Each structure stands twice: as C-alpha cells, then as structure tokens.
Design a binder for this molecule. Structure first.
Ligand SMILES: CN1C(=N)N[C@@]2(c3cc(-c4cccc(C#N)c4)cs3)CN(C(=O)c3ccccc3)C[C@H]2C1=O
Length: 386
C-alpha cells in the first residue's frame, strides 16, 4: 500500500551508486550505506581512510561481538578485507525495528572507497550463496526477516535526475526509495509485471527476446543470458555479453545513423555534448528487454529510452552524456540504466521480480519508458544457460 516513512530514503546517482542511511552499534553510529542487490555482505569502513569522513568504531559499541574471523572480498574493480563480527543495526528511514546482523568491519581496501561519494559501507541484498567467506554468513536481509515480522520483500525506485548533480545537489536531492517489506503504489504507474527469480544466489532472471526500436536482435536467446542475467543496483550500466553487446551497438548505431559518433563514445570512454536543451533524443532508439513471465508460454517487455542509457555528466552550458551500455564477460547486468526506468520489486517470498514504469523516470513529450504484456513466447526455459 503506502510506506511514507521509507519513501524518498535514498540518495546518490547511477555513476556513484545509491545509498541509504543506517545505524550500527550502541549508542547508534550513523553511516551511509550503498544499496547493492549484486552482493550479499553487509560491510562497513572500520578504520581511517582518506575518502572516509566517518567509520565504524567497534570499541565504542557496547553491543559489538567479535566473530574472530577474517573476510577477504576480491572483485573485478577492486577489493576489501575485514574482520567479521555482529552488532545491532537499524535503518532510520526504514522499518521500526532493530536487528542483530553480521558486519564485515573493513580494515583494508583497494579501489573500494570513492573520493567525494557520501557512502561508508555496502549493503549486500543478494542471497547467502554468494556471501563471503561462504554461505554460513547470514546476509542482512535474511537476519531482518528472521528476527522481525517484516515481509520477505523489498522494492527499489532508483531516480536518475536526467541532468548532472553537483556535490551539494547530490546531498540535497532525493535519489529514490528503498521500501523494506512492501510495495508503495505512489512510486509507479500502470501494472507490475513479474519475472521468476531463476535461482536464489544473485537476483537471476531470464531474458527471452531483445528489440532495438521494435527490431528483433534475432540472436539465440541463450546468448542474452550467457552465462547469467541479473538485476544489480550496484552496477551503473546495462551490461551485455560480448556477442549481444556487439549486435546491440551495431543496431543502435544503425538506428542513430543521422549522427556519427566516434568509437570512444560507444566504448563508454568519451563523452558526447550538445548545445543546451538540444539533445536529439528522437534519433536514438528505444530498447526493449522481454522477460520470462509467471504464466507458461507468456512473456512481458520492459522498454527504456536513450534518457536511461545516455548517462548525464558535467563537461560549459552544454548537455553532455556518456554511453551507459557496455560489454560483459559475466553475463547480462541490468544495472542503474535499467533500474532508473522502473520501480523494481524484489519479491523474495514468491521467488519473483516485479517491474513497473517508474514515477521518476526521465522521458520527453514523445516517448515514455514502458512495461507491457502479455506476449506469447515458446521454449523459454531453453533461454537459460547451464
Ligand atoms: C558490480 N558489483 C556489485 N554489484 N557489487 C560489488 C561492488 C560495487 C561497488 C560500487 C561502488 C560505487 C558505486 C557502485 C555502483 N553502481 C558500485 C563497489 S564493490 C561488491 N561485490 C561483492 O562483494 C561480491 C564479491 C564476490 C561475489 C559477488 C559479489 C561485487 C562488486 C561488483 O563488482
């Protein structure tokens, strides 16, 4: 229904991620926490760092419990190393509950913390399977559901501004909403359409068809989910497997052919600028992703605009952007590019993910983002990779 206490509780932008305010310890220590559906650890800065304005101080918390166990989390972009423990955790603009959760106290990190970001930790919302060191470390959401009456579901509305936000603006602006234990009807328009969670590790989904301006990409559907397709709030871009990316970029260049862009723009490296208010949105195509439906032989589609896939950046009074669709060697990643177009319901209780047109998506007077169905699709289980 309505969860007014949790509506507008996020801040940030796609390129830097979105964070929620949380408290750790007794007396409560306030920290800004990155919302990450692509990882399963709750981990906070717990030692001084040049990019941290604050950090978790275990010796000042009376409820802190040392697990006497190390935790190492190397990833593609960087790494962090810490010490496992437990403490009492709350979400001020969240449910009115206090939970004892696992905390990875970060003591050493490489390329993890970001200069100028207003976050000090990460909230891994995915399943116990991918948690580090192993699945025995109960993720935050599992502890919250086990210890309280909070329904096993969360929903995210990530709000892209559609223009650059400076440091004071990104601090004063509402970046979106994280609704813990419910679906807020004010954050979306139209219907919610659900896709099954294929397996509970990452939030894995199955893409069954891809269109660029209604034109079928015409690849074997396994290619779209090779080696997996996941919904990840901790990824800025829409990331596509190498073969899909090459086919998508060729189609997008063909649809936008009235204007020639250098190779560096398509690589996500170079920005493209237009005179204030003159971005030619109409020359760029819409992108539709068809997802497996809940009903046998049934699919639905989510459609995004270049206002989602052209990430706004500051250069001048020019309107500048980076191409936010990139190659992946780890399958499809429906990051902030997708997320910003839609209100996304992570229905863990019914092993499904919901999509509806976001009330905060950026569009123009001619086109809007869309969630439509049903469509008749066959051999959909065959689209999943093994
Ligand atoms: C994409 N992606 C992600 N979803 N989560 C991680 C990080 C995201 C960011 C980060 C920082 C600022 C902004 C944004 C944004 N947008 C993201 C830093 S680290 C954490 N991680 C695991 O812990 C893990 C480890 C092993 C296995 C699975 C997950 C995998 C990392 C990753 O590569």
């Amino acid at each position: 229904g309505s969860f007014v206490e949790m509506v507008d509780n996020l801040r940030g932008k796609s390129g830097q991620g979105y964070y929620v305010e949380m408290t750790v310890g007794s007396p409560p220590q306030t920290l800004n926490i990155l919302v990450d559906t692509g990882s399963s650890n709750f981990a906070v800065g717990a030692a001084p760092h040049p990019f941290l304005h604050r950090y978790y101080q275990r010796q000042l918390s009376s409820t802190y419990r040392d697990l006497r166990k190390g935790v190492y989390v190397p990833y593609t972009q960087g790494k962090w190393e810490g010490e496992l423990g437990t403490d009492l955790v709350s979400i001020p603009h969240g449910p009115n509950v206090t939970v004892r959760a696992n905390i990875a106290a970060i003591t050493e990190s490489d390329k993890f913390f970001i200069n100028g970001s207003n976050w000090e930790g990460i909230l891994g919302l995915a399943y116990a399977e991918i948690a580090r060191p192993d699945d025995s470390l109960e993720p935050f959401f599992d502890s919250l559901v086990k210890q309280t009456h909070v329904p096993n579901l969360f929903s995210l509305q990530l709000c892209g501004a559609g223009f650059p936000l400076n440091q004071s603006e990104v601090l004063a602006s509402v970046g979106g909403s994280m609704i813990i234990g419910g679906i807020d009807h004010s954050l979306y328009t139209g219907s919610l359409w659900y896709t099954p969670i294929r397996r509970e590790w990452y939030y894995e989904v199955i893409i069954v068809r891809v269109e660029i301006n209604g034109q079928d990409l015409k690849m074997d559907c396994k290619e779209y989910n090779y080696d997996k397709s996941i919904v990840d709030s901790g990824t800025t871009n829409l990331r596509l497997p190498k073969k899909v990316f090459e086919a998508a970029v060729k189609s997008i260049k063909a649809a936008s052919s009235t204007e020639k862009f250098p190779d560096g723009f398509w690589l996500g490296e170079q920005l493209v600028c237009w005179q204030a208010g003159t971005t030619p949105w109409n020359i760029f195509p819409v992108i539709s992703l068809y997802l497996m439906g809940e009903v046998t032989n049934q699919s639905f589609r989510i459609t995004i605009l270049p206002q989602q896939y052209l990430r706004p950046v500051e250069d001048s009074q020019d309107d500048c952007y980076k191409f936010a669709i990139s190659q992946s060697s780890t399958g499809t990643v429906m990051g902030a590019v997708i997320m910003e177009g839609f209100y996304v319901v992570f229905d863990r209780a019914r092993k499904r993910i919901g999509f509806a047109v976001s009330a905060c998506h950026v569009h123009d007077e001619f086109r809007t983002a869309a969630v439509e169905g049903p469509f008749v699709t066959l051999d959909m289980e065959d689209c999943g990779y093994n």
